[PDB]
Symmetry: C7
Subunit: 30 residues, 7 copies
């Protein structure tokens, strides 16, 4: 349903946040 689909979109966006945090860690190390 549409509520579950929207919640999956939230989960996808949170994974994008995780990735961006990894890019911060990598950037600091460089």
């Amino acid at each position: 349903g549409e509520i579950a689909q929207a919640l999956k979109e939230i989960a996808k966006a949170l994974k994008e946040i995780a990735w961006a945090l990894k890019e911060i860690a990598q950037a600091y190390k460089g």
Copy 2:
């Protein structure tokens, strides 16, 4: 529905957080 729409707005805001984190990564690289 309005609940699914509001959840999609939460997903969009989380994407904005990810992009802001990328700006921090880019700042650390400079």
Copy 3:
């Protein structure tokens, strides 16, 4: 309805977090 409105308030608060992250990036850059 009140649930959808409250979810929109969460989305707004998340946009505030994105802005504060942009402030961190700017502060690091000088």
Copy 4:
């Protein structure tokens, strides 16, 4: 409703996170 009230408490806590992030930006300045 109690669900909408609890969602509002989530939004208030997210604004606290935004403010704490602004404090990190102020620390970086500084």
Copy 5:
């Protein structure tokens, strides 16, 4: 209700995140 109670626990956890971000700000200033 149990859903409202769980949502309150999420708000409490978000306040702990704000406090931890305070700790980062204070640690950077030290």
Copy 6:
């Protein structure tokens, strides 16, 4: 109640985020 249980899992995951932020503060210290 599976929805309530999953929301409790969200709260637990958020507490893990708070702990990881304390680890960042400890790195600065």
Copy 7:
């Protein structure tokens, strides 16, 4: 149900954020 499953996906994505923040802590220490 699918709503509960999507909420569990959100919890998993939050754990990924915690892991990424630990990568930042390790970077700051090094």
